[PDB]
Ligand binder design. Structure first.
Ligand SMILES: Cc1cc2nc3c(=O)[nH]c(=O)nc-3n(C[C@H](O)[C@H](O)[C@H](O)COP(=O)(O)O)c2cc1C
Ligand SMILES: Cc1cc2nc3c(=O)[nH]c(=O)nc-3n(C[C@H](O)[C@H](O)[C@H](O)COP(=O)(O)O)c2cc1C
Ligand SMILES: Cc1cc2nc3c(=O)[nH]c(=O)nc-3n(C[C@H](O)[C@H](O)[C@H](O)COP(=O)(O)O)c2cc1C
Ligand SMILES: Cc1cc2nc3c(=O)[nH]c(=O)nc-3n(C[C@H](O)[C@H](O)[C@H](O)COP(=O)(O)O)c2cc1C
Lengths: 180, 180, 194, 194
């Protein structure tokens, strides 16, 4: 089974989490795992002004999402929604939606946040979009039950990285169960 | 695989939909399907005063939910939430939650509504609870993409019953794919 | 302006929060505050057996919600929704809905959790129902720090942690946010209604 | 009171709705209404190629949102969220957030869909962001029928159906609800702010 870890990160927190998710997924025999990012939409000038951490993962196109059996989406919490960069990217998946290309595939979500709350709303409002594509949504339950998170007030903790690894391992296991 | 269609209905609309969901699930070879209701919480006197349609399906206990591979939950739209009767019933599943008994099982939701809106919110706020139990959530996508619905202003339509049948068939098929 | 603090509590955490909300609201001259609870639906024997807390607050009827300018709703988090008791009570407000009785009145929400998860969803899924009634929804955001009566969660409404075992009680930091929420909502109610 | 109607539209449906919202708001003496759009993020060539509609409204900056007493946000439904363009714009309001610039101001939301699905989620997931800013959220409920300027969807905010092909335009029934939403919100803004 093919598993995509698809993420947006500005300051590296989701990037770190995405590596952990990928590690967990890679524990599952028969899971082929790849990590990609959505494009930065900010001109580099503005990204640098804001103190961003330049991302180096390969950039996904919206159309290649169709190639995977499971997609695990990472986004920072942005006032209780996904980031504009992830939203912009998902707004480019209209051609897949019309073709039913993601229908029935597994989806799961992880997030990063400060200490102000909103991470639950970010995850569940991301689920909405996944459901429009007919994706099967995988929460983590009481291994937020909605998906792995990292909370930075002011680097993810050991325990946060372990829950992220679990989410990857669990989703990848389901992907192999459904798809070989 | 064992599929439970678990519902609350006061005026029969969800009851009719539940039969359609069950029919669809029963199309799948290897799916064993049962339909049950959650208890009415209103004293019969008050249920009758309100013009309720007495329900005759076997009543589920909260604890038996653990026996199924997939649970398809039906609730009317009640100001954009599930009904109090379904909420009361799910508030009695604390013992299952602590034991992880529903973890990883398939869940899906259907609803009934008037013409005032709220059905999307009813379905997605039901998903939240399912996710606390670690259930895998199955939307219907563009077969609301969130689950089958029936809309009665002032009996479900042929097309509404067909989408409900589809939801049962699709969920049951996944249940057999995952569980034999 | 008349402000109702309407709550459900099984083990007393929301009850303590409700009292704090009412204390804050009472600070506003010209706000008449009252605290009421929704009925317990569990048979008394099962409630007592479960370690439920008996409570002094009068039991509200659905009809009387019409009599207030602002209603501040408290519910524990129950798998990311309001409690069955609060949901059952709100399902009895159909007559109010049909007459427009709550349209335009202020609403705000506070909650409690065992270990944190689901609080956000409890509050926002309660907002949905308030919106069907046409109520104006008041989140708390992150208020100016000098407006809290203690120096120093979510922007959706005040919350408190009960612990996995339910034995934790609200801290003064949590209660201060609850008091702020009451004061803020009551102030708005007086501004709109005298 | 100053009311901003801030919107995103690709094919003009939200634009037409925004104009209706502004018309309604303009009915309120003492409300100064303005309509602005968030920037298009698509390169002009791709936008034009996609059949996008060019628009007269001035482009808002994030900073200027601080200058209004009420902000009525319009966005099409994009898989049950606001558009990437509106989300990108709101992600630039961090400075406003930190200073409390929008705290306590009125917010309300309107939308559009191709075939209906997801409108409710678009509106309520936009409310989430408004709540992080501490804005007071105004749903429309089901208003008294005599307040609509046409005789005769959701209680969350006004919406309109564009059709699967995008060729449907808002009906006078839909626009009447949009006009009501503007009038209602502007009235509240004047009541709170003069
Ligand atoms: C515009 C904006 C909005 C934010 N909103 C929230 C929020 O709602 N809650 C919160 O606690 N943190 C919020 N944050 C902080 C980010 O979620 C947090 O810094 C996260 O770790 C960043 O992930 P990244 O390093 O992968 O970009 C926000 C940040 C930005 C830039
Ligand atoms: C308290 C209450 C609240 C309701 N809220 C809504 C609502 O939010 N939107 C709507 O269109 N219909 C609403 N309805 C109507 C029911 O969703 C509708 O009648 C449904 O068909 C009933 O399903 P049943 O026959 O299975 O009980 C509500 C009904 C009740 C009793
Ligand atoms: C059925 C049930 C479900 C619960 N769900 C959650 C939950 O989703 N998240 C959580 O942290 N605590 C959960 N709790 C703990 C309650 O939120 C806790 O008992 C409550 O906040 C205490 O408030 P009270 O003393 O006012 O009843 C649940 C409790 C029960 C009985
Ligand atoms: C990427 C994308 C996703 C969309 N998602 C939905 C949707 O979830 N539900 C729906 O009925 N229409 C959907 N639509 C149709 C838009 O809602 C429609 O184009 C919009 O309402 C028109 O508003 P506008 O003319 O102001 O851009 C989508 C359109 C795009 C481009």
């Amino acid at each position: 089974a093919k598993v995509l870890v698809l993420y947006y990160s500005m300051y590296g927190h989701i990037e770190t989490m995405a590596r952990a998710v990928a590690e967990g997924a890679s524990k599952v025999d028969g899971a082929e795992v790849v990590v990609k990012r959505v494009p930065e939409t900010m001109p580099p000038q503005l990204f640098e002004k804001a103190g961003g951490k330049t991302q180096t993962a390969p950039v996904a196109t919206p159309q290649e999402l169709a190639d995977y059996d499971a997609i695990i989406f990472g986004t920072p919490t942005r006032f209780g929604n996904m980031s504009g960069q992830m939203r912009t990217f998902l707004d480019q998946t209209g051609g897949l939606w019309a073709s039913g290309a993601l229908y029935g595939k597994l989806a799961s979500v992880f997030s990063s946040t400060g200490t102000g709350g909103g991470q639950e709303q970010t995850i569940t409002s991301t689920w909405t979009t996944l459901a429009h594509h007919g994706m099967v949504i995988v929460p983590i339950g009481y291994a937020t039950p909605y998906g792995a998170t990292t909370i930075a007030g002011g680097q993810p903790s050991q325990e946060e990285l372990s829950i992220a690894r679990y989410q990857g391992e669990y989703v990848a296991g389901l992907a192999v169960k459904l798809n070989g």
